[PDB]
Amino acid sequence: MNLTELKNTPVSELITLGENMGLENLMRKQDIIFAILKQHAKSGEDIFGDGVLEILQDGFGFLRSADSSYLAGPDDIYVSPSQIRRFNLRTGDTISGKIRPPKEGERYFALLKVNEVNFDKPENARNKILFENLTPLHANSRLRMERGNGSTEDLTARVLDLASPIGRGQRGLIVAPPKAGKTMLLQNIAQSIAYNHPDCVLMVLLIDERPEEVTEMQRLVKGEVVASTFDEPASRHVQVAEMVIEKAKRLVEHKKDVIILLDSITRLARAYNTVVPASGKVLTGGVDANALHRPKRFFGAARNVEEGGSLTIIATALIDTGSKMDEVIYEEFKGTGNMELHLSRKIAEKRVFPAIDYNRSGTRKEELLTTQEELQKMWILRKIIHPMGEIDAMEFLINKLAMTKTNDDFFEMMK
Amino acid sequence: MNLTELKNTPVSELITLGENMRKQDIIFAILKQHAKSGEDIFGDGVLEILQDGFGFLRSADSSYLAGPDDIYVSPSQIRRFNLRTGDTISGKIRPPKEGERYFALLKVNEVNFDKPENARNKILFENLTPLHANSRLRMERGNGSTEDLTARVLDLASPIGRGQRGLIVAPPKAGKTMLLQNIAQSIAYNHPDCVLMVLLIDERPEEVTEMQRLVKGEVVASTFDEPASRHVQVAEMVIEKAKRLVEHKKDVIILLDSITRLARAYNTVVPASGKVLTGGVDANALHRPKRFFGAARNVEEGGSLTIIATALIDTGSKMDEVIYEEFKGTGNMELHLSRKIAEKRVFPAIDYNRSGTRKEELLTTQEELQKMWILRKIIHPMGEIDAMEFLINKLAMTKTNDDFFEMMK
RNA sequence: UUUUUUUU
Ligand SMILES: Nc1ncnc2c1ncn2[C@@H]1O[C@H](COP(=O)(O)OP(=O)(O)O)[C@@H](O)[C@H]1O
Ligand code: BEF
Ligand code: BEF
Ligand SMILES: [Mg+2]
Ligand SMILES: [Mg+2]
């Protein structure tokens, strides 16, 4: 008997289930769940709820739900300050426990006992090392994207491993003009993560992008999808993004390998510039002087932790939009991240995919994510591709890789 | 028994030692019972004089910011030895009496690692007579490693001397930080005498811990997770500590990364004057970082202050162009790194033609400068990439720039 | 008014 489980089930099964208990005529869907929960409480049976914690300024908090993009919701579960102090809870902590309907003079479900804090024992949460105190590091463990199934979509993953490898805790960018292939390449990334790295906690944050891409992503990726389309204001974009990044930080505190696929971070950087207080100083392109400190900390949250776990963020960026702002935002994030995979519009207009700008792509300290021979073969491959043009490079590399199933067999053939 | 020593020792020691006798409470109790025994207590830190007259010995673990374990310094002690912000002080300390919240300083044993009575009367930093760098700080190791190529090309392109005021100018991902890391290793390799300080301002956290583990010196960091107000304060303490050591005839070298983002931090804190330069830079924002960078200088009296700081260009923001060109009119050494060279994966990605050091004849022998001048004319007609691929390969044949000059003739 | 836009 769980609240969010009742919210997921269709209304048809809820109305039928409510009639089995013997209730009055079945009112809006939200009322069906509420009336069913109350009747179950009358029997003496226990009730359960869950959600990500958000501590308000007064000291208490609520358990936001994913169906509201972790925003204020009618089914939020109140968390008393005493409960927060007892287990050292902070914003982002996923909480599950027994709940009770609101009494007379109350408007929210209350939390009686917390069973699980971040998918673990509540006691283990009391003693922990905070995210701000974790010792940072360069990416060590390689997150190989290559399927190896000889698929035609696998070409994008294979070229990615050769141009700019991705490790745990990476802070990368999929930089390209509109319609170059950023979103689908991000989708291609989500598929390889779900297949090759099911151990990682995969999240897909969609900020100020197309709505049909939201449903396409949530029915394609094997993970959680938090979205805030361009139908939403910048105020919502920021708040939604803040909740996701804090939930990631909390899981990293539990030695988890979290991956955040952001699209787009340039749209998110614009959102911050919309809500930022005017400083009297504006950068070239119309970007406030203090507007990029917030998005830089969001993107900068991604990091490799020595104590355990990691936070990876692969976000898409826009360039050559005619607006200098996007060049400033991109260059600022490049001075923050450690990996950039460029996509060329010139290649995309020839319908050559993946339309990857090989020379401009790359990863920092890639020797820590590749074997000694792998790096030496990638190093030689770049020297050969560099003199080529943008299009000739991809047409050459894709035709060579298509001859074999894996890059390892391609390297053996390369000899 | 020193307080700093007791803060570095693990908690297990405080337990075992405590039986023989929070971490802030235990250390406080152990030291408190050391005074009743009559035995002396010691502590250390960097002094910061507040506006009222008294001061506090800040700790390096708190990045020289306000700390719970800071040591109060009486105003009388400041007058008796002419102490100023930045002085490193060690001495006997006493646990706070009732009504006090901090340990107190009884008497100073060492002021900047010297005797207090001798630091009382010395020529101030603002009174030292400046000069152009006339003492060469050779970067080349001569071990034959691939990492030495950066140092060798650096010696040929832009020699660094004691008191230099240089810049590692380049766009993002060109190789500024690792260029800076290579410089730190050569200073610890060839110049153990110089006091090496590494100031990391508004940069990546992973580069902080990485720096700390490969550099033989002090690492003061303030990552981009920190406010601009913290950047300034931390940078103010480091530059003042450097000035104090220079007053003691010591060769201090500060490797900053990045100074461009430090200038941004000053621009965020600076009061609005109503006049804003092109790019969003307040007309008074650059004064503070300009006197920070301009603090570096060669001193005739003895010792010097060297500052090699990285700078950003081609960021799409006219602000960084104003900042870079302003520091260029302040410094006297510039090492540019090219993005198109780094994108071809040619390291070091040094723009040979646009790099150089002022008054380089004071840092090189007459024969050495001749060969550098000849090598200059040969490389100039070449393109950026071809220049590096040419110089790197010719240096690869040799282990030392001296044997490379022998092949020249 | 400055910065942003003009503007490269
Ligand atoms: N001398 C070098 N040798 C090999 N790789 C280098 C060198 N200099 C820079 N790189 C590459 O560039 C990447 C980032 O360069 P970095 O020093 O961060 O430039 P910046 O500080 O200007 O951002 C590193 O991960 C490294 O792989
Ligand atoms: F139009 Be694309 F998604 F940048
Ligand atoms: F991104 Be670099 F460190 F400027
Ligand atoms: Mg898209
Ligand atoms: Mg750098």
Residue A125 CB burial class (10 angstroms; 0-12, 13-18, ≥19): buried
Tracing tokens 């302003």 back to the chain, one arrives at B326
Nucleotides of C under 7 A from a protein CB: 1-5, 8
Amino acid at A256: K
Among protein residues, the one whose C-alpha sits closest to the C1' atom of C5 is A286
A359 Cα: distance to centroid of ligand 3 (angstroms): 18
Assigned token pair, B363: 């840092």
Chain A residues within 8 angstroms (CB to CB) of chain B: 132, 135-138, 279-285, 287, 289-290, 293, 296-297, 300, 303-304, 306, 324, 327-328, 330-332, 334-336, 338, 340, 359-360, 362, 364, 379, 382-383, 386
Instruction: Name the residue among B67, B130, B132 with its Cα closest to residue B103.
Output: B67
Which atom of ligand 1 approaches the CA of A365 most closely? Answer: 25
Is the distance from the beta carbon of residue B176 to the nearest atom of ligand 1 less than 6 Å?
Answer: yes
* Closest among A31, A120, A115, A25 to A75, alpha carbons compared: A31
How far CA B112 is from CA of A235, B54, B168, in Å, comes to: 52, 19, 30
* Tokens 């069913």 found at: A36
Q: How was this structure determined?
A: X-ray
Cβ pairs bridging A and B (under 8 Å): 89
Exposure string over B50-88, b if 16+ CB within 10 A, otherwise e: eeeeebbbbbbeebbeebebbbbbeeebbeebebbbbbb
CA neighbours within 13 Å on the CB side: how many for A303? 30
Q: How far apart are the first and last CA of chain B?
A: 63
Chain B closest CA to A43's CA: distance in Å?
48
CA-to-CA distance for B330 and B130, rounded, in angstroms? 14
Q: Specify the long-range contacts of residues A270-278, CB closer than 8 Å, at least 24 apart.
A: A270/A208, A270/A234, A270/A325, A270/A329, A271/A207, A271/A208, A271/A234, A271/A235, A271/A237, A271/A238, A271/A241, A272/A234, A272/A238, A273/A325, A274/A234, A275/A234, A275/A235, A275/A238
Estimate to the nearest angstrom the gap between the alpha carbon of B299 and the chain centroid: 17
User: How far does the centroid of ligand 3 lie from the alpha carbon of residue B353, in Å?
Assistant: 22
Which DSSP symbol is given to A250? H
Q: Report how far Cα A10 is from the mean position of its chain's Cα atoms.
A: 27
CA A249 to C1' C5 (Å) is 39
Q: Which residue of A has its CA nearest to B321?
A: A284
Q: Resolution of the coordinates in A? A: 3.2
Give the dihedral sign, CA A171/A176/A182/A185. negative
With beta carbons less than 8 A apart as the criterion, state whether A65 and A75 touch.
Answer: yes
Q: Which of B173, B211, B266, B314 to mutate to test the interface with A (most CBs of A within 10 A)?
A: B173
How many Å does it take to go from CA B328 to C1' C6?
A: 28
Contact A109, A98 (CB under 8 A): no
**Domain A128-415 CATH assignment equals 3.40.50.300:** yes
Return the closest-CA partner of residue A4 out of A40, A42, A41, A37.
A37
Distances in Å between the Cα of B252 and the Cα atoms of A42, B2, B83, B191, B302 are 76, 26, 19, 11, 11
Spanning CA of A281 to C1' of C3, the rounded length in angstroms is: 5
Which of B258, B265, B199, B256 has the alpha carbon at shortest distance from B228?
B265
CATH of A2-127, one of 2.40.50.140, 3.40.50.620, 3.40.50.200, 2.40.30.10: 2.40.50.140
Distances (CA, A) of B385 to A263, B340, B380, B381: 35, 8, 12, 12
Cα dihedral B278/B282/B285/B287 (nearest 10)? 70
A170: distance to nearest CA of chain B, Å?
11
Vertex B215: Cα angle to B213 and B221 (nearest 5): 75
Q: List the B223 CA – C8 C1' distance (angstroms).
A: 35
Distance from Cα A268 to the centre of ligand 5, integer Å: 24
| CA B210 – CA B214 distance, rounded (Å) | 7
Name the residue at shortest CA distance from atom 1 of ligand 3.
A335
Using the CB atoms, write b or e for B210-238: b if 16+ within 10 Å. bbeeebebebbbbbbebebebbbbbbbbb
| Cβ–Cβ < 8 Å for B200, B222 | yes
Q: Where are the domains of chain B?
A: 2-121, 122-409
Which residues are registered as beta bridge partners of A225? Answer: A204
| Ligand 2 atom 1 nearest Cα | A178
CATH fourth-level superfamily of B122-409: P-loop containing nucleotide triphosphate hydrolases (3.40.50.300)
Q: How far is CA B400 from CA A86, A232, B136, B161, B406, in A?
A: 64, 63, 17, 19, 10
Sequence-distant (6+) residues with CB within 8 A of A308 are: A255
Closest nucleotide (C1' vs CA) to B282 is C3
Residue nearest to atom 24 of ligand 1 (CA): A364
User: What's the maximum distance between 2 C-alpha atoms anywhere in chain B?
Assistant: 78
Do residues A185 and A341 make contact, with C-beta atoms less than 8 angstroms apart? yes
Residue in this structure with the two tokens 């902080």, named with its chain if needed: B208
Structure tokens at B336: 């540019």
Residue closest to A256 by CA, chosen among A206, A297, A305: A305
Of all helices (H) and strands (E), which one includes residue B57? strand B55-58
Eight-class DSSP state of B249? T
Distance from the Cα of B24 to chain A's closest Cα (Å) equals: 18
Q: Please tell us whether the domain made up of B2-121 is placed in CATH 2.40.50.140.
A: yes
Rounded CA-CA distance A82/A349 in Å is 59
